[model samples]
Target: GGYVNIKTFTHPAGEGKEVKGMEVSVPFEIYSNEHRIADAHYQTFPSEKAAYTTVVTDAADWRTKNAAMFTPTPV
Candidate 1:
């Protein structure tokens, strides 16, 4: 549910025609009051692939460092 922002610039008078910028979207899953999975704002990216991939890697690294969030889950 996200996308990448492709930036491009064109100078009318040939004044610094270039592109330098980026953005992405990352949606996280957070259980609601009903104890069901729901959407949450983890980060903002410009691409869905980026959002999912980044979050996966982020969780792998971060979830361990924190070691106090969701623990032991399977059903």
Candidate 2:
């Protein structure tokens, strides 16, 4: 199992430009019954509009059925 972080960015060029959002730079550790997993970072989009664009334009399965789940958040 894993978790994802969603951020928001705004740019003049729309969804085709760079991204601008909060920068998270903290490290931690996750421990289980007999093992430990290193903390890592991932990107997620909670916004309906952003999520929609990202999945369609950036995702590899843009043409697949799951393409409707992503949106672009430009910066």
Candidate 3:
């Protein structure tokens, strides 16, 4: 099975009146068979705690449901 590395960090409030950045972001590094593969990103909440409780929670569930995605293919 594969694994997901979720590191939640706080970011300064975005600037600019046009496209603004999020106050917080949940970065995900997904790996398959210990090999770095893809990634996922999302802005959940302004609070780091909230971002983890929700983003991580959902991502973990996703990993559980898609466990096969992490497995290495047979040669």
Residue pairs whose backbone atoms clash in candidate 3: 2-70
Q: Which ten residues in a row have the lowest lDDT in candidate 3?
A: 16-25
TM-score: which candidate is best? 3
Q: Give the Å error, residue 71, model 1.
A: 22
Instruction: Find the candidate with the highest lDDT and give its number.
Output: 3
Output the TM-score of candidate 3: 0.20
What's the CA error at residue 27 for candidate 2, in Å?
A: 20
- What RMSD does each model have against the real structure? 16.0, 12.5, 13.5
Q: Tell me the tens digit of each residue's lDDT in model 2 across 10-43.
A: 3333546533333221111111112212212224
Question: Which of the two candidates, 2 or 3, achieves a greater lDDT against the reference?
Answer: 3
Error of 2 at 75 (Å): 13
Alpha carbon lDDT at 72, candidate 1 = 24
Please count the clashing residue pairs in each candidate, in the order shown. 9, 12, 1
lDDT of each: 0.28, 0.27, 0.31
Q: Write the per-residue lDDT of candidate 1 for residues 1-75, one digit (tens) a residue.
A: 444322222212224332222222222331111121122212233544543322332434433422322222222
Rank order (by lDDT, best first)? 3, 1, 2
